[PDB]
């Protein structure tokens, strides 16, 4: 919980509206599908799928985005015999959470006021693509924020009677 | 307002506790005091001071931090005649807000639960040093966030009866 | 010359192969073309085109990439009466340099050896999309590097006879 | 070799003069010395030291720099029994390379012209602090660059006779 939060505190982050996050899932999934060659026969245990995902993620860009080529190059870091399985399993896992992000519109619609202003909802994620896709695929939680602001004038000294 | 928040969603951002922001002000201010040579005689108008601050900020690093040398080099972009004035005026503006930063402990301490969890307070600022210092010195507002998280299990389909 | 270099030294940068830079031009140009509504009647002087480009660039993401929506939103910062002209002129300017990047394959093919290794050629650009597109569109030069490496063992002390 | 360079093209990078890199080593080392408490008794094997360094690096900021607190917090991720040893071993490894950094002044001083201009030497490292410190401490090589530029006018079509 607070480990996830500290992970976010220790790196450059990015604000996503629910729509923008849904769109990112659509883009990543479509690129990965372009890499599909033959369908898998065997299917990685979740134990081995985790080890392969590690290699895949270490080969992804830490730039803020990834082109199909970047994704396909990262697929190569995956042991060859397991590549097909890894890839179809990755797509299935992403397509399953892809549907789930739509449920954030519920939470994100609840009005909130902070510092006397309506505070909009935004998912909070790593700016780094490798760190971000790792979070979306394997973490149990997704962070988010309610955003507001404090005017500096309201931070000035306003007497001993508060 | 919304203009300020869009500026934040369009770039890599960073989470600051009130303590780490106060510490950042302390670091930037002592570095700038190290660049002080002579005392200013006549000082800049908010018109000319802003023109000079723009040149100063354009010469600052867009990396996440700035060393003394980076700050002193940026000072050189300021017209030589207006430099000592610009510098003393900049230090005074920063020291004034430096005290106001302490007032954020009020707001920050106010309890809040989001998604059934304690939602900690964090100032939200640009990752880029040039962008961050511009906001802290020139803007009338300072953005912040209340942070929380949704577990993916809670985003799964829970049936037709809410 | 060295001003351009210092600008690169003061911010996070990115290495582009000639092919990857060509592909980036193709992506940006196609997105901007999707924003075209009606053809321009008047056409911005280069003086006014520069002022409008400034506004456009200030509204672009400082994240490492931009989606069509990000580009189209930035187009709105452009004075309305001049939007059409700005946009067609921006596309023409990009399409003209797009052809020119192909000439980098000449320079980039010249073999080079640094530290006893073949040193590959890479264009060097801002990680920030707004800073990058500003450079590609309006600077007179494009930076690049020849990359190599020094082994730490070769940096150890090797006697007084060198 | 090429593995190291691909790692560099897949993330935001930063240009360091030999002086600024030497200064970075000085800063990181004095901060780590501030975390020293007791003297280590028994020390880690390169096997166990690397296992501990991994945990240490994962807890470092991916922001471009690290404060003393960031470094000291990262030290806590190291098993408590191996911590004082890990820390003294880390300081010794850094001080050893700190001296080797000075040898880069040889290579760096060697003249070079690229595209008919003096091509300055710069060490090339990750923007992320965690990635940068990992490379400097663990890698057998250090990447560098010779920097230059091509004017767009020189990329225009110059005719069929070369």
UniProtKB/Swiss-Prot annotation, chains A, B, C, D:
SUPFAM superfamilies: Hypothetical protein HI1480 (SSF103277). Pfam families: HI1480. Gene3D superfamilies: 1.20.272.30. It comes from the Bacteria. InterPro entries: HI1480 (IPR037180). This is Uncharacterized protein HI_1480. The lineage of its organism: Bacteria, Pseudomonadati, Pseudomonadota, Gammaproteobacteria, Pasteurellales.
């Amino acid at each position: 919980e607070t480990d996830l939060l500290m992970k976010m505190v220790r790196q450059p982050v990015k604000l996503y509206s629910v729509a923008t996050l849904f769109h990112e899932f659509s883009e990543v999934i479509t690129k990965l599908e372009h890499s599909v060659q033959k369908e898998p026969t065997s299917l990685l245990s979740e134990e081995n799928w985790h080890k392969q995902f590690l290699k895949f993620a270490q080969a992804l860009p830490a730039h803020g985005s990834a082109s199909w080529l970047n994704l396909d190059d990262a697929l190569q870091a995956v042991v060859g015999n397991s590549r097909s399985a890894f890839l179809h399993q990755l797509i299935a896992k992403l397509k399953s959470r892809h549907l789930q992000v739509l449920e954030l519109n519920k939470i994100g619609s609840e009005p909130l006021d902070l510092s006397n202003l309506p505070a909009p909802f935004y998912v909070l994620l790593p700016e780094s693509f490798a760190a971000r896709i790792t979070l979306l695929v394997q973490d149990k939680a997704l962070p988010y924020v309610r955003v507001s602001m404090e005017y500096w004038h309201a931070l000035e000294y306003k007497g001993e009677l508060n």
